[PDB]
Amino acid sequence: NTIGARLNRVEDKVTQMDQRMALIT
Amino acid sequence: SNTIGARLNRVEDKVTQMDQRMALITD
Amino acid sequence: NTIGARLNRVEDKVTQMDQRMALIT
């Protein structure tokens, strides 16, 4: 897959883990 | 070893493992 | 912005959150 595609996928994922975080801690 | 591409690789590895450990912290 | 800054910002975020998880497990 493309770097453009991969980069986007990781920016959102980090964003998702951050929200799972926020709801706990 | 340090192109945007090689570093992307590392950052997705870290993200992958981090996402699992996370299932142990919360849903 | 650029692909470089975007990768930097994401490394930045991943790093901050790893230290937060490292405290727990």
UniProtKB/Swiss-Prot annotation, chain B:
Organism encoding this protein: Homo sapiens
Implicated disorder: Long QT syndrome 1: A heart disorder characterized by a prolonged QT interval on the ECG and polymorphic ventricular arrhythmias. They cause syncope and sudden death in response to exercise or emotional stress, and can present with a sentinel event of sudden cardiac death in infancy.
Sequence similarity: Belongs to the potassium channel family. KQT (TC 1.A.1.15) subfamily. Kv7.1/KCNQ1 sub-subfamily.
Entry function: Pore-forming subunit of the voltage-gated potassium (Kv) channel involved in the regulation of cardiomyocyte excitability and important in normal development and functions of myocardium, inner ear, stomach and colon. Associates with KCNE beta subunits that modulates current kinetics. Induces a voltage-dependent current by rapidly activating and slowly deactivating potassium-selective outward current. Also promotes a delayed voltage activated potassium current showing outward rectification characteristic.
Oligomer and partners: Tetramer. Heterotetramer with KCNE1; targets to the membrane raft. Interacts (via C-terminus) with calmodulin; forms a heterooctameric structure (with 4:4 KCNQ1:CALM stoichiometry); the interaction is calcium-independent, constitutive, participates in the proper assembly of a functional channel and also acts a calcium sensor. KCNQ1 channels interact more strongly with Ca(2+)-CALM than with apoCALM.
Protein name, entry field: Potassium voltage-gated channel subfamily KQT member 1
Record annotation: effect of changing G5D: In LQT1 and JLNS1; affects plasma membrane localization; strongly reduces potassium current; impairs binding to AKAP9 and the targeting protein kinase A (PKA) catalytic subunit and protein phosphatase 1 (PP1)
Localization annotation: Cell membrane; Cytoplasmic vesicle membrane; Early endosome; Membrane raft
Tissue expression remark: Abundantly expressed in heart, pancreas, prostate, kidney, small intestine and peripheral blood leukocytes. Less abundant in placenta, lung, spleen, colon, thymus, testis and ovaries.
Description of post-translational modifications: Ubiquitinated by NEDD4L; promotes internalization. The ubiquitinylated form is internalized through a clathrin-mediated endocytosis by interacting with AP2M1 and is recycled back to the cell membrane via RAB4A and RAB11A. Deubiquitinated by USP2; counteracts the NEDD4L-specific down-regulation of I(Ks) and restores the membrane localization.
Outcome of substituting R10P: In LQT1; uncertain significance
Region of interest: C-terminal assembly domain (tetramerization): 5-27
Coiled-coil residue windows: 1-27
Outcome when changing N9G: Reduced cell surface expression and moderately reduced potassium current
Domain notes: Each channel subunit contains six transmembrane segments (S1-S6) with S1-S4 forming one voltage sensing domain (VSD) and S5-S6 contributing to form one quarter of an interlocking pore-forming domain (PD). The segment S6 is involved in the inhibition of voltage-gated potassium channel activity by KCNE4.
Variant or mutagenesis effect after changing N2D: In LQT1; decreases outward potassium current; decreases plasma membrane localization
Effect on the protein upon substituting A6W: Reduced cell surface expression and strongly reduced potassium current
Note: Mutagenesis experiments were carried out by expressing in Xenopus oocytes or COS-7 cells KCNQ1 mutants either individually (homomultimers) or in combination with both wild-type KCNQ1 (mut/wt homomultimers) and minK (heteromultimers).
UniProt-reported outcome of changing T16M: In LQT1; uncertain significance
Region (Interaction with AKAP9): 4-27
